Amino acid sequence: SEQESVKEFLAKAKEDFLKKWENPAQNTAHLDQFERIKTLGTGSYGRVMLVKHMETGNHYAMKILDKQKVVKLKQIEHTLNEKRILQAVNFPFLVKLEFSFKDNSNLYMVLEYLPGGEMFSHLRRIGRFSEPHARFYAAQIVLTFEYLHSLDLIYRDLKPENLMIDQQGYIKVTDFGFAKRVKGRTWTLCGTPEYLAPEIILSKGYNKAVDWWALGVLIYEMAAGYPPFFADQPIQIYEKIVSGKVRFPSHFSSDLKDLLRNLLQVDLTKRFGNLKNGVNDIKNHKWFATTDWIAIYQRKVEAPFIPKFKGPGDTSNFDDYEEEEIRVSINEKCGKEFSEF
């Protein structure tokens, strides 16, 4: 039975997660084991660098956080939770944390390198994705949220910026900074304005249904080339979200608009993914009728777009950033705060 298979898989996956969650892996590498190639990304968190593991010649993306800045920006819990979740999860569409360690000044997350770059760049370059192209990425998100939500995990930051394309043209969810273990409800104001569910904006207690609303935003942005709610300032974006009046481009198929009306649903008792049949309301929708869910999960489906492969450490799909020094203090900074990292 196909439904008996999913239940057994999820039961084993929960058991694997709880074990790693209870006793997280720590200090599984050292900085001297790597060679820096190029800064791939920057921000308040710190930076992401393409690195080369000296012994193997293998390439990885290394996220480096400055402990002092993390403490100053009050992101200690956010940083610890990001790493604790990432080392405990295992799914084909989730970025793998290969190693983690810390020194006197920094925290290091060595992640699987995704040379295809961000979906964001590909989407802005092409303008908009066709419906079968958008469908292929959407299907991977559906299976990822089904996995995360079974572990009582809410993602909270779905957007093309947090999705990256691998060598096979398959996607990977990246940033686990806003991911949270939620048994019942949560109230924290977090996520990206364009992707926020009305209940977050309205300061209500919320759950995993916020991720299904964000899926509706993602699908709309992939298909149209722009989000369903946009404006110059976040405040003006929020007013559009709470209004809920969605306009669809004329090129959107009827099956697409229908699915979108059910995901971009203000009423929590009517939003797909949040009803009696849970994820199956989405999986069995007409828009996903040509989707072979097992073939997507098993990565057997031919991707609609395969990025230009030019070596394992190729950086052509990333923007250039100022190459800043990696300073390591002689003095141990914030030792107590990052004890569990």
Binding site: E118, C190, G225, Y226, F230
Partner: peptide
């Protein structure tokens, strides 16, 4: 058009979390 409104706006780049 809707795309034109978006393109001319200040939110076409990578968006930060709040």
């Amino acid at each position: 058009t809707t795309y034109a409104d978006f393109i001319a706006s200040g939110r076409t780049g990578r968006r930060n979390a709040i």
